[PDB]
A paper describes a structure:
The archaellum consists of an ATP-powered intracellular motor that drives the rotation of an extracellular filament composed of multiple copies of proteins named archaellins. Instead, archaella are structurally homologous to filaments of the type-IV filament (T4F) superfamily. As is typical for other members of the T4F superfamily, ArlB1 and ArlB2 consist of an N-terminal hydrophobic α-helical “tail” and a globular, C-terminal β-strand rich “head” domain. In the assembled archaellum, the tails constitute the core of the filament, whereas the head domains are exposed to the periphery.
Here, we use electron cryo-microscopy to elucidate the structure of the archaellum from [name] at 3.08 Å resolution. The filament is composed of two alternating archaellins, suggesting that the architecture and assembly of archaella is more complex than previously thought. ArlB1 and ArlB2 alternate throughout the filament, following left-handed helical strands. Recalculating the helical symmetry of the archaellum based on this observation resulted in a helical rise of 33.4 Å (5.57 Å × 6 = 33.42 Å, refined to 33.4 Å) and a twist of −71.8° (108° × 6 = 648 = 720 − 72°). While the α-helical tail domains are identical in ArlB1 and ArlB2 (I14–A59), the head domains show differences with respect to sequence and structure. The most striking difference is a glycosylated outward-facing loop (K131–A137) in ArlB2, which is absent in ArlB1. While the head domain of ArlB1 harbours three glycosylation sites (N112, N133 and N176), ArlB2 features six (N70, N113, N118, N133, N134 and N180). In both archaellins, the metal ion is coordinated by five conserved residues, which differ slightly in their position along the backbone (D154, D156, S158, N166, D169 in ArlB1 and D157, D159, S160, N170, D173 in ArlB2). The flexibility of each [name] is enabled by a hinge of two residues (Ser60, Gly61) linking the head and tail of each subunit. To allow for this flexibility, the tails in the backbone rotate around and slide along the filament’s axis, whereas the head domains swing diagonally to the filament’s axis.
Residue numbers in the entry:
A (entry chain e): 118 to 221
B (entry chain g): 66 to 221
C (entry chain A), D (entry chain Q): 170 to 221
E (entry chain f): 67 to 225
F (entry chain R): 67 to 119
G (entry chain S): 13 to 65
H (entry chain T), I (entry chain h), J (entry chain D): 13 to 66
Write the structure that this text describes.
Amino acid sequence: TNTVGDFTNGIKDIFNTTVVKWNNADATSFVVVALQDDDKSLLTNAVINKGDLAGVLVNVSAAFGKHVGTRERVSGYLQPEFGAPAVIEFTTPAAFTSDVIELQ
Amino acid sequence: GVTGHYVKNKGIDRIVIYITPNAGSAPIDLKQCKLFLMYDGKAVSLNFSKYDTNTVGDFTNGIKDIFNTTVVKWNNADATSFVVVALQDDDKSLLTNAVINKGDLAGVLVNVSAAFGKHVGTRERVSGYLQPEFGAPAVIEFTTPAAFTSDVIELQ
Amino acid sequence: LAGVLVNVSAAFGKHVGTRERVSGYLQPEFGAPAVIEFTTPAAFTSDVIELQ
Amino acid sequence: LAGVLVNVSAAFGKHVGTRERVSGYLQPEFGAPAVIEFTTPAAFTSDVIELQ
Amino acid sequence: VLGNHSGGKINWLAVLISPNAGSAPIDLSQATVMITDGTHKVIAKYNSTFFNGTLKNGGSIFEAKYNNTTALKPLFDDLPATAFGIVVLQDADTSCSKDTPVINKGDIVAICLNVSNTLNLKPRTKVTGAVIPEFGAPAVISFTTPATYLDTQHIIELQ
Amino acid sequence: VLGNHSGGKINWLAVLISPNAGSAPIDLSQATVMITDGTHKVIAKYNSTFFNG
Amino acid sequence: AIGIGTLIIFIAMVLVAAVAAAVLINTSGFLQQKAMATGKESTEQVASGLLCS
Amino acid sequence: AIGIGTLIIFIAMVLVAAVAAAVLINTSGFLQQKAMATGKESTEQVASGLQVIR
Amino acid sequence: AIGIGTLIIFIAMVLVAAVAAAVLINTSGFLQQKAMATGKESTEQVASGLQVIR
Amino acid sequence: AIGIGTLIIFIAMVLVAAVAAAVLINTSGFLQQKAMATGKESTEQVASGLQVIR
Ligand SMILES: [Ca+2]
Ligand SMILES: [Ca+2]
Ligand SMILES: [Ca+2]
């Protein structure tokens, strides 16, 4: 119902379904959750400016059609309309052993 | 070093912590440093406070007994502060605006029984740090012995 | 090499204390200005101090 | 990776002895030259030596 | 990092933090903290209600009060599940004010978080996280809770 | 490195090898090995006939 | 007459600097990945192990 | 005019040097935790044990 | 003519590179003293002491 | 036309940047040998010696 999910004041758990509303993460889109934004730019027409921090949610298992396994790499770029793209690159660890993992 | 005073049938009432700067350290502005101490149920921060009428108690020429009340003036050791007694200082830095520099030795007095609200008993540990405004903190750590048996004890 | 003398306590109307910064520029009639910037130390302990 | 063979004893007219240095460059037609530099060891003691 | 304990858990954490040498002033009112126990990942932000300045002059952490208008009440017990509070432990130049906590060279301040229901910190549990400022490099929280908690030692030093 | 022995000599060597941390994949079919005993200097290259997976 | 040309070559200066900047920015990106990877991998190698009891 | 490009390339040079600095700051963070833990843990291991009285 | 600007910007480039070099030379000076002293002092500390004979 | 000079000064700029690069390539060569030798030699020194049996 709103352009960007307003969690400027904190989240109990970023992955709990009822709190966060993952449902619009279809196999072909992402959604954005606003974590810090003084000037209300994220919250209104979705513009990042200086000092903002925002989180992109992707339903990977639906996007790639399967769950990513251990010892596998994933790489990409988030490419804006103008300007340099943010590189993403990580290799999933050898041993999954906890529910939330810091791929970093 | 650390040393401490035992009141009979009660426990350790007060403690004196001896402190010195490390080789090559730049001068440390003692009056801004804070001392954090942990014990069985409390974690307390204490801030510098002036000795009577003067910044640091001048005992550069010796003390009959560091714990005798009338000589030493313990009274400003409130439940939230410490006071500093200057034991060796050639250049008069401690004595004037409270700055430790090379070769100085000074003693911090803490009224532990007032700070933690009770006397510390036998077989108990206390640990902390005296953290300066910049630079590395002095670690404090000791376990009170099993049997108190004399008035002044060398917790060290 | 030349040395500029300034009576700071008269210029600013008080003596500058510890932990305070002072910054400025000496600006010539033409050409680039000399930047000045320093923070007075935490503990004054000698008469002549090398603010540098 | 390729290996250049040189008949040193014929090139310099004598065998190179112990404790002696030899230095040079292989200079291509364009681009940076490969530097060569080594000092023969103090004690020859095996037939093939790793001057490296 | 320090941590009160009752029951089978660590229930409050107090994360003491200070500027890096030569840093420009950091405005904590715009910081964000992120913590995970490997089963959940909370993110929390400053609620101005929970400030205690007085402790710059000494006192007990973990028993600090705060001021809802007309009363004084205990800080840690009241702090909401998605928020962090702040307690000034050293500040020479009164730079921290309740509406604008800006820390400058020399200051030390404790970020107070109540984790009792949000993260399940039983023994032998890894905790990972960061305090992320508006600009500049994050502080990294990283500790594993002890193997044994003892009833004689309710305050624990974690990092 | 491991080495079978008969008679008065070591006759076969088996040199176990693995990548350095963070290395890109190495194609051994284009490697070269060089060994010397101080009297001779052999250089040897991969013959695909001799693989056991 | 002179004015016209000045404008045109100015445009080229801009574009050529832009193209060069792209190289530097991109390349920095390409290296960022491998730089981190190498450090993490190397640490995990030195720190980890098993011990016979 | 030559000035125009000199400005633009400076912008790039700054940005690249920033990115390069970042990786070292980040990596130093990663190593900090790993180092500190390794020391603590190793110490506790040596220091501790049990003894059979009778 | 294009040459005119090329000259002028070179003058600037030199000057900036000079200033940048300077800070490293200066800083190396500052660190020299601090390092040398720290070593000396620390050495004397370990090396020295008194012993009670009787 | 302005274009004429722009071309000519580019030729110069390239050439200067070449010369500047060269000195670093050359110097890296000089340092290579000096470094490698210093390490080898120092190692042999520590590693070697004689022992009087009787
Ligand atoms: Ca914004
Ligand atoms: Ca002194
Ligand atoms: Ca401050």
